[PDB]
From a paper:
Neurospora crassa FRH (frequency-interacting RNA helicase) is a 124 kDa homolog of Saccharomyces cerevisiae Mtr4 (56% sequence identity, 73% similarity), a Ski2-like ATP-dependent RNA helicase that plays a central role in activating the nuclear exosome to promote processing or complete degradation of RNA substrates. FRH has been extensively characterized as an essential component of the circadian clock in N. crassa, a function which doesn’t exist in S. cerevisiae and is not dependent on enzymatic activity. Like previously determined structures of Mtr4 from Saccharomyces cerevisiae, FRH contains a largely unstructured (169 amino acid) N-terminus and five structured domains: two RecA-like domains, a small winged helix domain, a helical “ratchet” or DSHCT domain, and an arch-like insertion domain that includes a KOW module.
The purified protein was crystallized in the presence of 0.2 M Sodium Citrate pH 5.6 and 19% PEG 3350, resulting in a trigonal P3121 crystal form (FRHTrig) that is unique from the previously published orthorhombic P212121 FRH structures (FRHOrtho). Furthermore, rearrangements in the ATP binding site in RecA1 result in a conformation that is consistent with productive nucleotide binding and hydrolysis as observed in nucleotide bound Mtr4 structures. Thus, the FRHTrig structure appears to be more representative of the native nucleotide binding conformation. (3) The most prominent difference between the two FRHTrig and FRHOtrho structures is the conformation of the arch domain. Rotations about multiple hinge points in the arch result in a 30 Å displacement and a 70° rotation of the KOW module with respect to the FRHOrtho small cell position. Hinge points are observed (1) at the base of the arch where it projects out from the winged helix domain, (2) at the junction between the arm and the forearm, and (3) at the junction between the forearm and the fist (containing the KOW module).
Residue numbers in the entry: 141 to 394, 425 to 737, 744 to 846, 850 to 1106
Write the structure that this text describes.
């Protein structure tokens, strides 16, 4: 077969094994297909659904807009037909809820489990996040026994530095009998992933890949302060080099541009447009520049006011009053939207809704909006292409470009998607070209050990940590990489052992000396050529010695004058001195030519004809000695016998002072410690002339060889390291260390049996969030006498890694914080004690205390407005922190329960009741 169009298929088979057997036919059909129609299937869908129908797992690799969700539906239907259960894991928050709404309306027998809520836990199809899958798995719930199929939507999130590990963990933990549908972006090494699944779960895994986009993209560049946009990638995906070149020239010649771009987009009916930025602040800034315009008809204005109010009706005439709403509404009314994680969740949803219904023509959003469900536009504008990964500025990866740009082009309603990238004031071509002809990044494991992990593996009879390491995807990519690396290492060793033909050990001395001279000579040029020490002595006729650009020697010359041109940026390189020198190789220039260094002028002399003596211009970076003498120069100094005549007076002075000519100390009086750090540089210059090598001609041959050997040695050491971190033992060191920690702290015995404290520590699941320390805290007490509302605030002290400002701490609050920071200190201690790369101070200091009072007063009954007034943290971030906090609290009630402190557990529940109220207890618009 049937349909055909740029579709690649592959299959993964388990490692032998593959020996017996079970053949006899087992080759189609074999079952009927549920919910085929309505629309005709695309061949890539047909293929993947065939894989699923045959009960074989399959990884689909296609762009997000390509319609991957249809395949998920089929597995659910098939599961529902066989009275089986299926699990839809979504990577993150809101979209799982949305997908739940879609599946609920479709299949009815559907439930939802997130951090915030639980729906229909007996349903045949459970939508849940990966993290909950991890917890429920470690807990070993019997539900998992009935599960036949797991669909992973957006599986490429396994490459996430903090959350990828969760994905991997739950994959490894599933029973081999289970089958998987992996939905992914067009990653390049899908096959490898399939193969890993095949090995570890002893079953086939198909891979369906295709380079298919329903609506094609055109990419345009806008240079900053430029006059328009340049098409740089056309519908056929052909790169137009020349326009890029023109654009960069448009930037070499070169706030408000965003407004002009939007106005242009408006004039040509390219709306709706998503304008991406990478900071909430930048988002609001951009909206301010935009806000002069108005994109809605009075009827549209009416429509959005009606929809908005219809959403707000559930709240109250006091919640309606937060200034984020009152002053966001005039923007919405003008047809301008904003979207970022700082807004209230209810605004994120209602703004999404107003965008989907076509009431918002321009939407300024941060990256996260790019992965929202079914919300594309006609045009996408990148406000920049630089993102901080930390103390570095990254040009956004191809995968990011794909993911964001995929929101352009609306399948039903648009002929094409228009993508306009505003460019940075400075940018090299190879990086941009790499992005726009984007090759997707590997799905490389980001596995790392965690305390909840290790503890849980140890806790269960039939499984072990060593197992997990052996079966890890990271390790699989290692066991793949290693033979290539040992082959590189061997090639390097051969080159090393083969280039060892320079002989001598005087070379080593030479290298050391040369580099020492370059550094010390740099010190000497520095400061001594600076006007602050050197300048004052600018009399006419004074004899000065010239440093020469690199290291040559034009000898002593009489200063003629000194000029300084300002437009010449280093301190030393600024003043220009005209000096008379005993020039020979002229040639270039004539009189005044140049410029950057005297150029063509060759020193000496002695072997001249043709000596000349002329006044040449040099800059102040070029200097060295200044000497202590001045001759009287004639006022009319432009004649053969007279320039050369001054020269005659110079040779006679030089003949009069052997072992001289004595020089001016430049630093003495506007000391001198530097001089004793100055004679040695000369000594080393004598060591150089002493070296037999200095004369031979090979020289540079032997030197470049020495360099190669030293480089190769460094590279080799590095390769042995890469091999070490390609070997399971690196991570195993981390493991043995963490085992030391667990013994020394008392969570498990030396016989590797989990204790009650380990068992309670198990039930705390947080991204990096110490999880240990809370357990220690409990058994150490430090919670016995706190009221619930106080306890809330203290627990709030662990989730916020964001910045807030401006408050003092009362003593009755500063002290418990201090005591916990003390516990953190003992823990980071034992951590260093056990060879962990933990930086003992950053751990201890990671528990930020500046938000204790906001949460405390919220827990004591303050209204939302007031606590929003007590900090600069964004409203949405605040509600997010509360939501993690509630989830955390449920976890703490659990661990208290599982250590029999019934009183603590009930207390935490009561705390939940204080926190879990009003807007913080808000249900989702989708549910």
């Amino acid at each position: 077969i049937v349909l055909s169009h740029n579709i690649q298929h592959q299959v993964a088979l388990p490692p032998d094994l593959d020996y017996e057997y079970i053949p006899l036919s087992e080759h189609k059909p074999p079952a009927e297909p549920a919910r085929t129609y309505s629309f005709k299937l695309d061949p890539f869908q047909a293929l993947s659904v065939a894989s699923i129908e045959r009960e074989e797992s399959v990884l689909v690799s296609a762009h997000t807009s390509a319609g991957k969700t249809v395949v998920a539906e089929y597995a659910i239907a098939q599961c529902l037909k066989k009275n089986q259960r299926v699990i839809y894991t979504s990577p993150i928050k809101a979209l799982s809820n949305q997908k739940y709404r879609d599946f609920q309306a479709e299949f009815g027998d559907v439930g939802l489990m997130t951090g915030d809520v639980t729906i229909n836990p007996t349903a045949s199809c459970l939508v849940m996040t990966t993290e909950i899958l991890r917890s429920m798995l470690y807990r070993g719930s019997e539900i998992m026994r009935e599960v036949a199929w797991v669909v992973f939507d957006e599986i490429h999130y396994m490459r996430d530095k903090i959350r990828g590990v969760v994905w991997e963990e739950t994959i490894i933990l599933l029973p081999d009998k289970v089958r998987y549908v992996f939905l992914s972006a067009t990653i390049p090494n899908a096959f490898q992933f399939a193969e890993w699944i095949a090995k570890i779960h002893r079953q086939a895994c198909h891979v369906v890949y295709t380079d298919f986009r329903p609506t094609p993209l055109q990419n345009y560049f806008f240079p900053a302060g430029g006059k328009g946009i340049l098409l740089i990638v056309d519908e056929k995906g052909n790169f137009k080099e020349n326009n890029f070149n023109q654009a960069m020239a448009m930037i070499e010649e070169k706030k408000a541009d965003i407004a002009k771009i939007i106005k242009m987009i408006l004039k040509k009916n390219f709306q709706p447009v998503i304008v991406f930025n990478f900071s909430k602040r930048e988002c609001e800034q951009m909206a301010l520049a935009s806000s002069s315009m108005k994109f809605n008809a009075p009827d549209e204005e009416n429509m959005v006011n009606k929809v908005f109010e219809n959403a707000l009706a559930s709240l109250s005439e006091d919640d309606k009053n937060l200034p984020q709403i009152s002053n966001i509404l005039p923007l919405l009314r003008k047809g301008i939207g904003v979207h970022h994680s700082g807004l209230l969740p209810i605004l994120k949803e209602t703004i999404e809704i107003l965008f989907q219904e076509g009431l918002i023509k321009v939407l300024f959003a941060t990256e996260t909006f790019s992965i929202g469900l079914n919300m594309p536009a006609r045009t996408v504008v990148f406000t920049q292409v630089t993102k901080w990964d930390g103390q570095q500025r990254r040009p956004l990866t191809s995968s990011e470009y794909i993911q964001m740009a995929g929101r352009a082009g609306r399948r039903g309603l648009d002929d094409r998607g228009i993508v306009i990238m505003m460019v940075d004031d400075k940018l090299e071509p190879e990086t941009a070209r790499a992005i726009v002809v984007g090759n997707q990044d590997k799905l490389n494991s980001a596995f790392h050990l965690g305390y909840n992990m290790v503890l849980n593996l140890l806790r269960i009879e039939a499984i072990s940590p060593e197992y997990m390491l052996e079966r890890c995807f990271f390790q699989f990519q290692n066991a793949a990489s290693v033979p290539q690396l040992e082959r590189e290492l061997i090639s390097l060793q051969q080159e090393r052992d083969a280039i060892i033909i320079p002989d001598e050990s005087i070379v080593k001395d030479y290298y050391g000396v040369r580099q020492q001279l370059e550094e010390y000579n740099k010190d000497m040029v520095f400061v001594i050529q600076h006007p602050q020490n050197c300048l004052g002595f600018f009399q006419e006729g004074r004899l000065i010695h010239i440093k020469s650009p690199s290291g040559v020697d034009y000898g002593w010359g009489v200063l003629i004058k000194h000029i300084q041109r300002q437009t010449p940026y280093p301190e030393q390189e600024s003043y220009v001195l005209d000096v008379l020198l005993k020039v020979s190789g002229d040639f270039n220039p004539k009189t005044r030519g140049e410029g950057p260094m005297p150029e063509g002028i060759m020193p000496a002399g002695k072997d001249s004809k043709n000596a000349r003596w002329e006044v040449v211009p040099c800059l102040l970076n070029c200097l060295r000695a200044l000497g202590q003498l001045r001759v009287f120069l004639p006022k009319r100094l432009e004649s053969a016998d007279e320039k050369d005549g001054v020269g005659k007076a110079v040779d006679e002075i030089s003949r009069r002072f052997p072992d001289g000519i004595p020089i001016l100390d430049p630093m003495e009086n506007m000391d001198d410690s530097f001089k004793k750090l100055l004679r040695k540089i000369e000594v080393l210059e004598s060591r150089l002339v002493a070296n037999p090598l200095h004369n031979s001609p090979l020289l540079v041959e032997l030197w470049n060889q020495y360099s190669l050997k030293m480089q190769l040695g460094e590279q080799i050491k590095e390769k042995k390291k890469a091999i070490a971190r390609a070997h399971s033992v690196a991570q195993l060191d981390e493991l043995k260390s963490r085992k030391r920690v667990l013994r020394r702290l008392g969570f498990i015995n030396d016989a590797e049996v989990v204790q009650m404290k380990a068992r309670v520590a198990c039930e705390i699941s947080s991204t990096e969030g110490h999880e240990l320390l809370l357990a220690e805290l409990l058994f150490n007490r430090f919670f016995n006498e706190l009221s619930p509302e106080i306890c809330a605030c203290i627990l709030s002290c662990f989730i916020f890694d964001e910045k807030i400002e401006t408050q003092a701490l009362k003593e009755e609050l500063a002290k418990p914080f201090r005591e916990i920071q003390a516990q953190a200190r003992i823990i980071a201690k034992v951590s260093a004690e056990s060879k962990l790369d933990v930086n003992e101070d950053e751990y201890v200091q990671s528990l930020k205390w500046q938000l204790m009072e906001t949460v405390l007063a919220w827990a004591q009954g303050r209204p939302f407005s007031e606590i929003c007034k007590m900090t600069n943290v964004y409203e949405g971030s605040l509600i997010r922190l509360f939501r993690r906090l509630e989830e955390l609290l449920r976890q703490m009630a659990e661990a208290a329960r599982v250590m029999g402190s019934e009183e603590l557990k009930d207390k935490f529940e009561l705390s939940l009741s204080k926190i879990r109220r009003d807007i913080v207890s808000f249900n989702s618009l989708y549910l």
